[PDB]
Amino acid sequence: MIMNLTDKTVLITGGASGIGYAAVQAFLGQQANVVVADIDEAQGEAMVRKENNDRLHFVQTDITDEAACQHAVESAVHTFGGLDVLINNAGIEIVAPIHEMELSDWNKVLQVNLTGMFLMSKHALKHMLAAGKGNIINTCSVGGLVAWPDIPAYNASKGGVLQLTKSMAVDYAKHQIRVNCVCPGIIDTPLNEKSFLENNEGTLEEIKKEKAKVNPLLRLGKPEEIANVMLFLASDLSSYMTGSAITADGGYTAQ
Amino acid sequence: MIMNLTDKTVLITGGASGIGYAAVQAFLGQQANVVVADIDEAQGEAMVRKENNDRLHFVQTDITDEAACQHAVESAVHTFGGLDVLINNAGIEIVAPIHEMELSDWNKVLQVNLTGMFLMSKHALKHMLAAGKGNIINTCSVGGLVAWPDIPAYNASKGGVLQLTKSMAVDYAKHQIRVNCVCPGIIDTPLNEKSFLENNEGTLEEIKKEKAKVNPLLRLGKPEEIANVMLFLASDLSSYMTGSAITADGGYTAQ
Amino acid sequence: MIMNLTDKTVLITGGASGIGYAAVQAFLGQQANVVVADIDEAQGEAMVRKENNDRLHFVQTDITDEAACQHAVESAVHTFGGLDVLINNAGIEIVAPIHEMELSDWNKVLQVNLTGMFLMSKHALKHMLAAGKGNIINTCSVGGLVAWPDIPAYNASKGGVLQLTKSMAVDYAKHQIRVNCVCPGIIDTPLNEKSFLENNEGTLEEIKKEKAKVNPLLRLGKPEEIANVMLFLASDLSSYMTGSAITADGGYTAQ
Amino acid sequence: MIMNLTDKTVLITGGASGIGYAAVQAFLGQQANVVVADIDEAQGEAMVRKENNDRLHFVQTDITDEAACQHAVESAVHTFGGLDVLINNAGIEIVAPIHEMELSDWNKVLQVNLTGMFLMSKHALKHMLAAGKGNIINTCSVGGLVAWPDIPAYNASKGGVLQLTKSMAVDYAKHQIRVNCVCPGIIDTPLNEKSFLENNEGTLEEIKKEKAKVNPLLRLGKPEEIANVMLFLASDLSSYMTGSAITADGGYTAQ
């Protein structure tokens, strides 16, 4: 198959829910080996039980801790023999205006969304440099391109993700390590449902409709639709792409 | 399959050589029906004879002529029953500085690269509106994003392509017609080899070496590597993408 | 005065109304010499009679005619001794969807908005090369960056303007000819008020209220606010800027 | 005057050297009151002695400390009566590849370049909300737009700056607080000269010659040329601009 993901090993941060879990399913469906690095044990174990797949491994990981990042990379190499693709998908959203935001909250957002991406990438790159090739895919956002209202720390973190992506692409291209990002729009995931309710008036269904209408396609994205972009970026279909940002936003950033 | 291109009808302008023909091969490999609309009849007919594939059809087309564009769309509908995807790949490059460029040459570049894209899209859209869905993929360029040196009319036409892409995406999203573009870097095709030789001192091989070095990946792209982006954009893998520009440039625009 | 525009010669296309005329007033206020190239002779002569300013000259010009473009540039040089700044401001808007747009209408939009900018720039550049320096400022649009709904040919033209700007900047930097563009949002001019009324149901005041709300600043721009960006781009203040796009859109493109 | 900066109070972080100090001079020249917040007390005191201007005040400030940021804002309000403009110019560069970079160094870059910008903005915004208006100008970089080689943490931080700029613009536009950034290219400052020598073979003069050649204008920028963009952004000339990035890079990002 043209995508050529079979028997590749893919390490996905934040893989036990949402887009990350859709990515786990998509990569397992391509017969790739998947290592999930995520912070919640019960949630990781529930994923493993449901998938019931010898190509899947869960490693509890706090990506803000460098030792834990190193351990996650090692777990992939030990469990499956190597590491072909790192997907830095973990991220959090805290809603607060700049003039009110607690420094501790600012730091939490940047630490998970940006520092953790740095630390994971650092340890993956040490392996990929030695292996002579690799692929890093970062989950950016529409918020790395334009500003979503009311989430300035999140948007700032995602601008950091965008430029970290381009930077690693430029610095590592000579080493055959491709680095790209996906920039999702508004995706229908349980974490987003929670944020929808917390931050808007209305029932869940009313708010989903409101959020759908800001996109030209007039619907929210599904997590599988972002997973499918990650398949493409990991695959050989994207072999001449590095330093690219791929919007998957139902047209949001085209207007 | 996950790409879901089997039995889809794909009309490719400029399909009889270069990136266009690589796209023909990629789509035929997915069991799509392919209609090639291109200007050199002998070349098209030779492609058909060589391929010997009943899913391929050639229709001689000058895309600067509206009646010919309408006829190409009709040919797809008559030959294969419908039209699912239009790939506006035809384009030309004329090298001249602004201060010396002939108006006739300026017009030629804009007519093929931009007006012809409009005219093909116009007639494909009439059909796709009635079909209730569709997909348009435009060949843009790195030159639609940054300026390549010494080809200002080309760059201008490709900025037009970029914005035509976004505009059709915004205006037709509610009709389930996705519209995206690919932005290739420097691709090794026989046609580009001609431009290399005409615009630089040295042997062909010397000049190719020089062109390779300007990209982080340190090589020229292959036409199949652009075809594969087109496959993704046509496929269901990209279902939440519209109004997107996908760069495939070895990192060129990341620096 | 730090902007230092006194005795600079500025040629403004489309200068006899709207943003163009606000620019005329702004530049005359800075004691620059201003040559207006615009299509309506009566309108231009009325402007000259009203302004009663020896620093102002009007030359009737159809910018789609190359001889007229050459004559406009020559008239600036002959009248005031040189040509320091060309402002390519002329543009038109035709409202039509791609699937219905007449080829003749498509061509009109591209001819005025893009080809006329090429032709004016060609002839200005011949002069500026000989002078050893120059400055070209192009009126782009938010529509060169994202798609405004329902005006696809306009947006395409302005993507062309954006890339033509970058291209001339790259190609002529070594000749000390700086080339930049302004990307206005929705600007309150009598011409736009006519378009508002022609293309929407409601009173002028209702339509303006609706158009204001789409921008973070919650208001339309005044023409003088775009003229003031042009003052900056023409001035010495922008001496290290070339190939850049300055958005003046009340925040529209930041979301 | 048209810029209307007389008696406006401007707080400039990193104001005691380089671009920051050129901005100090430019704003003092417009009869604005200037408060410099910078980390080196001796350097600040030497600046004050040299400028010898009652419109200048220095307050030693570590912008990574929230209390110090608050104290800097308070010093502006207490010394001159209010705060009209915040210029977040402070930044540092550490050169290291991702795969080798120390977390402590990553954190230093992000803390100064991005967290400090957040904390200064937070406390400035509290004042500006109460005042009913304001202006924030952030020093971004070409590195916020594309990747400069070998400084990935720096580029990441500047992508953060870009998006923080857009976010505050979107969130505070309704409060009449404009927020924009400048994206400088390679600027000739004593601090950059030290980096040039540290990170390249050759004499200073040789290295400056090499750095100049990567820009279409074929020279490095002067710090005053960035200060002049800041004047424009603070001034009423930019009244319809918010959420904008102004590149001042000699054409670097146009290619």
Curated annotation (Swiss-Prot), chains A, B, C, D:
Coiled coil: none annotated. GO terms for biological process: antibiotic biosynthetic process. The active site is at residue 154. Induction: The compound guanosine 5'-diphosphate 3'-diphosphate (ppGpp) is essential for the transcription of the bacABCDE operon and GTP regulates the transcription of both this operon and ywfH via the CodY-mediated regulation system. Keywords: Antibiotic biosynthesis, NAD, Oxidoreductase. InterPro entries: NAD(P)-bd_dom_sf, Sc_DH/Rdtase_CS, SDR_fam. This is Dihydroanticapsin 7-dehydrogenase. The gene is bacC.
